[PDB]
Amino acid sequence: ASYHISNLLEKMTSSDKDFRFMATNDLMTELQKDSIKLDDDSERKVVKMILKLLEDKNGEVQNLAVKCLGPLVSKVKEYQVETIVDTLCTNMLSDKEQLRDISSIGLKTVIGELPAANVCKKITGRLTSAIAKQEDVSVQLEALDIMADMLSRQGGLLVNFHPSILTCLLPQLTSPRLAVRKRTIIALGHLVMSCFVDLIEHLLSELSKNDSMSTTRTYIQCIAAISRQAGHRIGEYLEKIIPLVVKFCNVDDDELREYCIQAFESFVRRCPKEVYPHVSTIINICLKYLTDDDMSWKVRRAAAKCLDAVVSTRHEMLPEFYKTVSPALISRFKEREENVKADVFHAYLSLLKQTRPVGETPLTMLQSQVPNIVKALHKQMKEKSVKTRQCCFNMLTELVNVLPGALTQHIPVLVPGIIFSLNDKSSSSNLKIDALSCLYVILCNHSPQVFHPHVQALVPPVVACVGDPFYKITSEALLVTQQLVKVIRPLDQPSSFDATPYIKDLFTCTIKRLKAADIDQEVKERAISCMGQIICNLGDNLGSDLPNTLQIFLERLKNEITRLTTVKALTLIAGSPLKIDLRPVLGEGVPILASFLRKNQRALKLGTLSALDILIKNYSDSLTAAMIDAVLDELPPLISESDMHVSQMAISFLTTLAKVYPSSLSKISGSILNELIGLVRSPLLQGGALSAMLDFFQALVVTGTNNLGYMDLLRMLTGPVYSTHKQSYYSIAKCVAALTRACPKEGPAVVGQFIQDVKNSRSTDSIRLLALLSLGEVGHHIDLSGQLELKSVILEAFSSPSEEVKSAASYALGSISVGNLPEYLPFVLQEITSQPKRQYLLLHSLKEIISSASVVGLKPYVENIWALLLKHCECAEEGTRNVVAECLGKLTLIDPETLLPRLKGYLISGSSYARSSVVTAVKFTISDHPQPIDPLLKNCIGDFLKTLEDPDLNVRRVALVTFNSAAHNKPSLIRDLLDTVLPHLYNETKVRKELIREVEMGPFKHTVDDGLDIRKAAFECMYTLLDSCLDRLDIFEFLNHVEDGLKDHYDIKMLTFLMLVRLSTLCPSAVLQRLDRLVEPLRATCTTKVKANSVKQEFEKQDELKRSAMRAVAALLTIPEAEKSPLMSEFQSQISSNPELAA
Amino acid sequence: YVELGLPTLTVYKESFESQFLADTERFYTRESTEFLQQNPVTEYMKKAEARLLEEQRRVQVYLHESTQDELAR
Which residue positions does N6-acetyllysine occur at (chain A)? Predict the structure, then answer.
């Protein structure tokens, strides 16, 4: 209320500090939290009181008033803001230093609080005269700092005041004080980002004209600063800056530092330039410039650092780097003080990083240059500085990582250095850690043979490193010990090394770490992994300690911390060439491992399932029933369609158990079988898991158990069908086929299925479809040639009212032919020509046979199939032509060397239908995964694309479709042929006025276009080219055609809008150069109106096109520097609705 | 399908949209399950991005705008 404000104002003059501090704090906290109904007179008194308190004699009150000044200006009338700014400005010029500091801090706080326009203009108007060359250095410093802060906070405004700011800032560059020069350089750098576009021209001209006079390093520093803070804008002046700087490279004065820095900044920021060799030579000659007393060392630092930008930014210059003196000088120059050596080593690390892959390859050159690096590192490994040794170890690690096996002959000289580094007392923890890491990396990426003679010299250091109070070094030593154990006794190769004398020590250093006794968790995990590896590799050499140490595995299984590590170690131990006796532990371990399946841990579930599988597979003579039902009690929960991997692992475990322990197969008749049956019909069931289930079924059928026979399984499988997804039918058919394959003596089953299929009465479509699928799957493997009544009923099933039965019969007709080609293939081949009313399904069956039959068995009939397909190439029906072309394409896959020339030779004089079929057939040959036909297709696609790109219309369409398919699937084939193909596509992307046939009826019109399809295919090809073939193309020749297609048919308009949206993100500069001609069609789209008396759907069809155009222009507006507004501010009532709908 | 059913999209949703969404869900679930088993997650990320871009292209080329919000969800 007013009374509270009045009493606070009255007490603010109590002459007592405690009263003056409490009232000000209350006022500040009230203003900070939604001050209520503050009358203008109250603002006046508050402002006056705060301004007077700013001059108080106690620092605390002044500081509190300064802090309160911030939240004050949040809610006050603008006039009080103006008068506060004016008062601060005039107090800034006061002689008193305390007043100057207080005013500067208050103005900085006000500027920081403000997000408004006139305040900044007045402040800038005052500071422009303040910064002028006067006799008060402190005032100049404060004004420069304030203007720099204001420019940094906001720069969008003050567009018209920028020339005055530049004019006042420019003379300050020659001030005798260097602090003034640095501050005005920072201010100019801040100002450059705000600006307008013209001011940079005057600034650059002023810098250029000042440089070609009595010069100072301040100008070079300013140039470097404004180039660092603004790179793209100053790019066009690269030609007018470098020669003048190079002219100053020969001055005896040590001013080369600034030149090296601005070169480094330019190379970091501005990539486009073509003066690399000259600057590289300058840097190389300046790197060896040496002649504490003499200041000649930061020049070397800058020269070495400048090469880092060249190495890292550029990737296509790697052969030029390797062949030149770029790495040679660095390898030679490795004897210098710590800082220069460190930065040179960092540059070489960057060079090695660039060498990593995405005649003389860079890897080959690096291998050839390895010996010099090895010699340099060996010479540098005797230094007493830990930093040099750390850098050498990092170099070794990077060199091993980039290419394995490089250090093959250099082991006998590199090992002494690592041993000396590890054994040195003055070495720090970091040096030991990185040396151990380098040793582990070298051991893991090299053959064990080279390390054998040094095995005697490598074990004591690692053993000593194990006994270290620092846990990180102990873990690194354990990791190195694992690789040492792997190397000394390999199991995948024969070795004659004797690792016996090193056994006990490797145990002694490990078993003590196995007994944790409140030790680090990572140490526990590493010790457990090393102990398990020791058991797996060197178990035979162990004596009586194995049974004692085997219980520690159970103890580490009991707790949750090391469950996964112990499970993995046990799995590794079980799956070893050396049969370790795990029987005493297995009895207790199996229930514990089984109990882990209840908790919801996917990784633990998979690990324990794998462990149980491997344990029951290796050890099957020591199993009891109790552990079996204990394990199987949790299986039904694990079998569900939600998790396919867990179900597959459970099926594999069940199959292994049935294989090794068929006795306990009577306990799966309950919930497990029901879950398996439910999973059989799951639509998501696919992949090897399905195969696994099949295997399981076979195994069960091999075993034989009550209520688990073949007939019972068939009844359970076919119950619901005989009493819904197609994949369920396919899975049931595959299961029935596998079960039939399990028992060869199952003849009556086929005849029963035949009776069910042929009996029309009391037979549903589902039963017939299932019978057809089962017969087809069964006949895929075993011969049915000795059984009659097959072909008749299959051909009868073709004439069915349901398309599912037709498809099933067509698929199953050729399925038996896979087993017996000579009897069935001629039959269908002759039936194709004999009966024309069913040749479609016969051709589909022939395609199925070609896809499924073995190549070696299909080779003799290749000529007959090719002759039949070529004779059927010219047909009146389109679907028959597509099927024939697809069959030809699939047949092309086998024996391509003989037949590809034959399709090659048909291009010379083939008819339009023949040429179209030839182009279509090669389309199906391209696959995403690599194929043996890839080089042949690469070599012969040239005429399929280039030579036949415009014979006729339909041929053009099929060629464009084939090109689109090739680009989508395997861009590598068309990667090198883009230059000779793109002009043809651009020709195809033009509208032709001879194929438009207008049909008019009264006042109505119906335009019919024939070459819409060709244009649409060309546009689809253009869109597909962006995915992988966008780098090597002229962007303008794409953008002009995009603009041309912007005014194309309605269907192509959406594709063009999508292309514009995609190009908004990719290469914004090219769109910027064409932002004026890419919007006029987009503006016409949002303005066009349709003629009245049209249907309602014709009213709404523009209502998505205009929305799409609105979205496209909104996406185009997202370019950072797309400030140009081509009459965009035209928002009447109707158009303005679209913005919010699009957003 | 948009024109029939007299914008009213009753026929379009009843006949085509629901079935298309169901098959899309099943196909994508199967593809993710089969891809995560062999190849690592780094390639799966790029495959998911490419599939999302392709679905956006399809829905903006030959599908109704009403399906844009649901399918992307």
Answer: 52, 904
Closest approach of B30 to chain A, Cα-based (Å): 6
Per this entry, what is the length of chain B?
Answer: 73
Experimental technique behind these coordinates? cryo-EM
Region of residue A1119 (phi > 0: left; psi between -120 and 50: alpha; otherwise: beta)? beta
Query: Which amino acid, A511?
Result: I
Structure tokens at A565: 């590590």
Both structure tokens of A113? 């609080």
DSSP A216-264: -HHHHHHHHHHHHH--SGGGGGGGGTHHHHHHGGG-SSS-HHHHHHHHH
Nearest to A990 by CA among A1034, A1063, A1048, A947: A1048
- Range list of H helices, A782-911: 790-798, 803-813, 821-834, 839-852, 855-858, 862-871, 878-893, 896-905
- Provide the token pair at A186: 């920072």
Q: Do B34 and A687 touch (CB under 8 A)?
A: yes
Residue with tokens 């530092």: A257
Residue A51: which of A15, A93, A102 has the closest Cα?
A102
- C-alpha span between A614 and A617 (Å, rounded): 5
CB-CB neighbors (< 8 A) of B7 in chain A: 1097, 1100
- Token output for A969: 């699937």
- Concatenate the DSSP letters of all residues of A571-636 into one string: HHHHSSSS----HHHHHHHHHHHHHTTSS--HHHHHHHHHHHHHHHHH--SS--HHHHHHHHTTHH
Give chain B's contact residues with A (Cβ, < 8 Å): 2-3, 7, 26, 29-30, 33-34, 37, 57, 60-61, 65
Distance from CA of A649 to the nearest CA of B (A): 12
- Which residue of chain A comes nearest to B60, CA vs CA? A1054
- Chain A hits for B41, CB-CB cut-off 8 Å, are none
What residues form DSSP beta bridges with A1006? Answer: A999
Chain centre to alpha carbon of residue A62: 56
Which is nearest to A884 in space by CA: A911, A922, A844, A849?
A844
Q: Which residues of B touch A1100 (CB under 8 A)?
A: 7
What distance in Å separates residue A940's CA from the closest CA in chain B? 30
B22 to chain A: closest CA residue: A683
Please name the amino acid found at residue A200: I
Residues 6 or more apart in contact with residue A44 via CB below 8 angstroms: A80
Asked if A1054 lies within 8 A of B3 by C-beta distance, the reply is: no
The answer to whether A142 touches A187, Cβ cutoff 8 Å, is no
* Nearest chain A residue (CA) to B36: A645
Structure tokens, A842: 């016969």
User: Checking DSSP bridges between strand A1004-1009 and strand A996-1001, what pairing results, if any?
Assistant: antiparallel
CB contact at 8 A, A1060 and A1078: yes
Site from B30, B49, B63 to mutate, A interface, most A CB atoms within 10 angstroms: B30
For residues A988 and A982, give the distance between their C-alpha atoms in angstroms, rounded to a whole number: 10
- Is A1055:A1107 a contact under the CB 8 Å cutoff? no
Q: Which residues of B touch A1108 (CB under 8 A)?
A: 60
CA distance A442 to A404: 9
**Residue A343 and residue A384 in contact, taking contact as beta carbons nearer than 8 Å:** no
Residue A843 near residue A832, CB atoms below 8 Å: yes
Q: Tell me A56's DSSP state.
A: -
Size of interface A-B (CB pairs under 8 A): 27
Cα of B11 to nearest chain A Cα, Å: 15
Going by the DSSP 8-state scheme, the letter that residue B13 receives in this structure is I
In Å, how far is B40's CA from the nearest CA of chain A? 15
Residue A71 and residue A25: Cα distance in Å, rounded? 12
Sign of CA dihedral A969, A971, A972, A974: positive
